[PDB]
Design a protein around this motif. Structure first.
Motif, PDB file in Angstrom:
ATOM      1  N   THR A 189      14.713   9.226   0.705  1.00 26.50           N
ATOM      2  CA  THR A 189      15.830   9.778  -0.048  1.00 26.50           C
ATOM      3  C   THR A 189      16.558   8.727  -0.874  1.00 26.50           C
ATOM      4  OG1 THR A 189      17.299   9.540   1.867  1.00 26.50           O
ATOM      5  CG2 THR A 189      16.125  11.659   1.607  1.00 26.50           C
ATOM      6  N   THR A 190      16.259   7.446  -0.666  1.00 29.23           N
ATOM      7  CA  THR A 190      16.886   6.361  -1.403  1.00 29.23           C
ATOM      8  C   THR A 190      15.938   5.725  -2.415  1.00 29.23           C
ATOM      9  OG1 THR A 190      16.450   5.110   0.612  1.00 29.23           O
ATOM     10  CG2 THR A 190      18.702   5.818   0.246  1.00 29.23           C
ATOM     11  N   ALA A 191      14.672   6.154  -2.460  1.00 28.90           N
ATOM     12  CA  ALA A 191      13.734   5.644  -3.450  1.00 28.90           C
ATOM     13  C   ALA A 191      14.049   6.178  -4.844  1.00 28.90           C
ATOM     14  CB  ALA A 191      12.314   6.052  -3.062  1.00 28.90           C
ATOM     15  N   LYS A 192      13.922   5.311  -5.839  1.00 31.47           N
ATOM     16  CA  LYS A 192      14.099   5.708  -7.225  1.00 31.47           C
ATOM     17  C   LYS A 192      13.076   4.970  -8.070  1.00 31.47           C
ATOM     18  N   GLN A 207      -4.694   0.896   6.411  1.00 31.16           N
ATOM     19  CA  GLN A 207      -3.347   0.374   6.229  1.00 31.16           C
ATOM     20  C   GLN A 207      -2.330   1.499   6.363  1.00 31.16           C
ATOM     21  OE1 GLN A 207      -5.814  -0.108   3.991  1.00 31.16           O
ATOM     22  NE2 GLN A 207      -6.259  -2.309   4.214  1.00 31.16           N
ATOM     23  N   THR A 208      -1.111   1.121   6.745  1.00 32.26           N
ATOM     24  CA  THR A 208       0.034   2.017   6.685  1.00 32.26           C
ATOM     25  C   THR A 208       0.590   2.010   5.266  1.00 32.26           C
ATOM     26  OG1 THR A 208       0.595   1.740   9.033  1.00 32.26           O
ATOM     27  CG2 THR A 208       2.393   2.328   7.527  1.00 32.26           C
ATOM     28  N   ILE A 209       0.869   3.197   4.729  1.00 41.30           N
ATOM     29  CA  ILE A 209       1.288   3.326   3.345  1.00 41.30           C
ATOM     30  C   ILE A 209       2.751   3.727   3.273  1.00 41.30           C
ATOM     31  CG2 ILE A 209      -1.004   3.844   2.536  1.00 41.30           C
ATOM     32  CD1 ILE A 209      -0.077   6.758   2.168  1.00 41.30           C
ATOM     33  N   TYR A 210       3.411   3.225   2.225  1.00 38.08           N
ATOM     34  CA  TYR A 210       4.733   3.685   1.807  1.00 38.08           C
ATOM     35  C   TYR A 210       4.596   4.926   0.929  1.00 38.08           C
ATOM     36  CZ  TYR A 210       9.056   3.330  -1.113  1.00 38.08           C
ATOM     37  OH  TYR A 210      10.229   3.568  -1.819  1.00 38.08           O
ATOM     38  N   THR A 211       5.327   5.981   1.284  1.00 39.97           N
ATOM     39  CA  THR A 211       5.348   7.209   0.496  1.00 39.97           C
ATOM     40  C   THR A 211       6.750   7.380  -0.084  1.00 39.97           C
ATOM     41  OG1 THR A 211       3.693   8.198   1.977  1.00 39.97           O
ATOM     42  CG2 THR A 211       4.951   9.726   0.573  1.00 39.97           C
ATOM     43  N   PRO A 212       7.005   6.969  -1.339  1.00 39.37           N
ATOM     44  CA  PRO A 212       8.389   7.036  -1.850  1.00 39.37           C
ATOM     45  C   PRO A 212       8.952   8.438  -1.923  1.00 39.37           C
ATOM     46  CG  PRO A 212       6.876   6.338  -3.605  1.00 39.37           C
ATOM     47  CD  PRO A 212       6.082   6.349  -2.306  1.00 39.37           C
ATOM     48  N   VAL A 254       6.709   0.645  -9.841  1.00 43.77           N
ATOM     49  CA  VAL A 254       7.820   0.033  -9.118  1.00 43.77           C
ATOM     50  C   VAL A 254       8.870   1.083  -8.788  1.00 43.77           C
ATOM     51  CG1 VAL A 254       9.497  -1.847  -9.007  1.00 43.77           C
ATOM     52  CG2 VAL A 254       7.464  -2.080 -10.441  1.00 43.77           C
ATOM     53  N   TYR A 255       9.342   1.056  -7.551  1.00 43.01           N
ATOM     54  CA  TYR A 255      10.505   1.792  -7.108  1.00 43.01           C
ATOM     55  C   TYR A 255      11.559   0.791  -6.677  1.00 43.01           C
ATOM     56  CZ  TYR A 255       7.408   5.737  -7.158  1.00 43.01           C
ATOM     57  OH  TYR A 255       6.588   6.739  -7.592  1.00 43.01           O
ATOM     58  N   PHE A 297       0.847  -1.177   0.000  1.00 45.53           N
ATOM     59  CA  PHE A 297       0.000   0.000   0.000  1.00 45.53           C
ATOM     60  C   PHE A 297       0.888   1.234   0.000  1.00 45.53           C
ATOM     61  CE2 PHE A 297      -4.491  -1.012   0.847  1.00 45.53           C
ATOM     62  CZ  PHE A 297      -4.432  -2.382   0.995  1.00 45.53           C
ATOM     63  N   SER A 298       0.486   2.262  -0.741  1.00 48.37           N
ATOM     64  CA  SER A 298       1.375   3.394  -0.914  1.00 48.37           C
ATOM     65  C   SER A 298       0.574   4.680  -1.052  1.00 48.37           C
ATOM     66  CB  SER A 298       2.250   3.227  -2.163  1.00 48.37           C
ATOM     67  OG  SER A 298       1.468   3.423  -3.333  1.00 48.37           O
ATOM     68  N   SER A 299       1.314   5.789  -1.117  1.00 46.63           N
ATOM     69  CA  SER A 299       0.736   7.090  -1.428  1.00 46.63           C
ATOM     70  C   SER A 299       0.097   7.129  -2.815  1.00 46.63           C
ATOM     71  CB  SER A 299       1.825   8.159  -1.291  1.00 46.63           C
ATOM     72  OG  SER A 299       2.879   7.936  -2.211  1.00 46.63           O
ATOM     73  N   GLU A 300       0.360   6.136  -3.665  1.00 45.44           N
ATOM     74  CA  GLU A 300      -0.211   6.024  -4.998  1.00 45.44           C
ATOM     75  C   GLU A 300      -1.491   5.193  -5.043  1.00 45.44           C
ATOM     76  OE1 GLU A 300       3.154   4.387  -7.191  1.00 45.44           O
ATOM     77  OE2 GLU A 300       3.844   6.414  -7.660  1.00 45.44           O
ATOM     78  N   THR A 301      -1.822   4.471  -3.977  1.00 48.57           N
ATOM     79  CA  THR A 301      -3.008   3.621  -3.988  1.00 48.57           C
ATOM     80  C   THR A 301      -4.280   4.462  -4.034  1.00 48.57           C
ATOM     81  OG1 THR A 301      -1.745   2.100  -2.593  1.00 48.57           O
ATOM     82  CG2 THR A 301      -4.098   1.662  -2.856  1.00 48.57           C
ATOM     83  N   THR A 302      -5.214   4.061  -4.899  1.00 49.94           N
ATOM     84  CA  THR A 302      -6.513   4.720  -5.003  1.00 49.94           C
ATOM     85  C   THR A 302      -7.088   4.941  -3.607  1.00 49.94           C
ATOM     86  OG1 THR A 302      -6.908   3.554  -7.106  1.00 49.94           O
ATOM     87  CG2 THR A 302      -8.820   4.477  -6.002  1.00 49.94           C
TER      88      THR A 302
END
Length: 330
Positions: free
Chosen positions: A65-68, A56-61, A89-90, A44-49
């Protein structure tokens, strides 16, 4: 290197297990379902609808600072229970229990199906089958274990799931204090991308052992034990009042019953699943009909040694050049 992380049931039935995983810099900690039946690490992420996220807890890329962004990569997966998810994908740094992989493919969900939305306790999946099943396109990506393997003291991970209790996933070492007796190793086929092996037979309760080969997969991401219809009928015939219900979707039994154990063979060794492990509780709140933890695989196309079976054992996933599986009582 090694890693060690505690895994915790999400509910009172052990429907699944979550393990905390650190992603990104600074770390964002998400609770993931470690799944030896699939090969995608998705969150789950900051991109999920927005309407598909419910607690849920979301990943925010953008905060890492290391996300690409892995340019042009997409993923899309469907699981045996009919659920699904997809996104982009990151790559980022991912740590489990002190073990760190840099450049791990972190698959960010743009869409998830309803069963994922409805489970607020699972923030994503971490796949531990073979990387040949990974769904990233047009460049397939490696699992966390595959990426870590060369750095590990030994190329293994172990699953020690608890019954109504926390357990442990270890990477890179075998904790000899975590099991009784010896570990029995058995051959694995990787031809379908799974930890696929052949059980040597079964027993019901105190009955005699039936020697018969049962090919199936060691799958931490499946709750129940799915076996051939002959075997499952032999089990439930020992429970007064048990029956297969098409309306419920499997074997049910009176909640007042005491269930017999089920034993499965690993080479010459035997793993005993206590009867209590096979009780998945009322089919609906307040019902006196209970759902069985051993079910027929006839409609799946593969036998599945899911959590019901695996939590009765200490399980070694050996990723040496020729992979094998090990089982010990505990």
């Amino acid at each position: 290197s090694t890693g060690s992380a505690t895994t915790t049931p999400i509910d009172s039935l052990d429907d699944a297990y979550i393990t905390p995983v650190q992603i990104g810099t600074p770390a964002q900690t998400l609770n993931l379902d470690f799944d030896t039946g699939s090969s995608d690490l998705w969150v789950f992420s900051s991109e999920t609808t927005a309407s598909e996220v419910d607690g849920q807890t979301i990943y925010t890329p953008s905060k890492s600072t290391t996300a690409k962004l892995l340019s042009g990569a997409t993923w899309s997966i469907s699981y045996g229970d009919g659920s699904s998810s997809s996104g982009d994908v990151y790559t980022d740094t991912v740590s489990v229990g002190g073990l760190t992989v840099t450049g791990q493919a972190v698959e960010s969900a743009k869409k998830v199906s309803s069963s994922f939305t409805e489970d607020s306790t699972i923030d994503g999946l971490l796949g531990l089958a073979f990387s040949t099943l990974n769904t990233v396109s047009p460049t397939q990506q490696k699992t966390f274990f595959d990426n870590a393997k060369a750095s590990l003291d030994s190329p293994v991970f172990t699953a020690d799931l608890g019954y109504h209790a926390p357990g442990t996933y270890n990477f890179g070492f075998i904790d000899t204090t975590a099991y009784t007796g010896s570990i029995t190793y058995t051959a694995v086929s990787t031809k379908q991308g799974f930890w696929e092996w052949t059980s040597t037979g079964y027993a019901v309760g105190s009955g005699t052992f039936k020697s018969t080969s049962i090919d199936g997969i060691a799958d931490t991401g499946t709750t129940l034990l799915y076996l051939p219809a002959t075997v499952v009928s032999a089990y439930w015939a020992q429970v007064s009042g048990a029956k297969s219900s098409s309306s419920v979707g499997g074997y049910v039994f009176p909640c007042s019953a005491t269930l017999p154990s089920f034993t499965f063979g690993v080479g010459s060794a035997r793993i005993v699943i206590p009867g209590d492990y096979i009780d998945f509780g009322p089919i609906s709140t307040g019902s006196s009909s209970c759902f069985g933890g051993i079910q027929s695989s006839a409609g799946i196309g593969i036998n599945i040694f899911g959590d019901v079976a695996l939590k009765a054992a200490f399980v070694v996933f050996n990723g040496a050049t020729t992979p094998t599986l090990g089982f010990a009582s505990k």
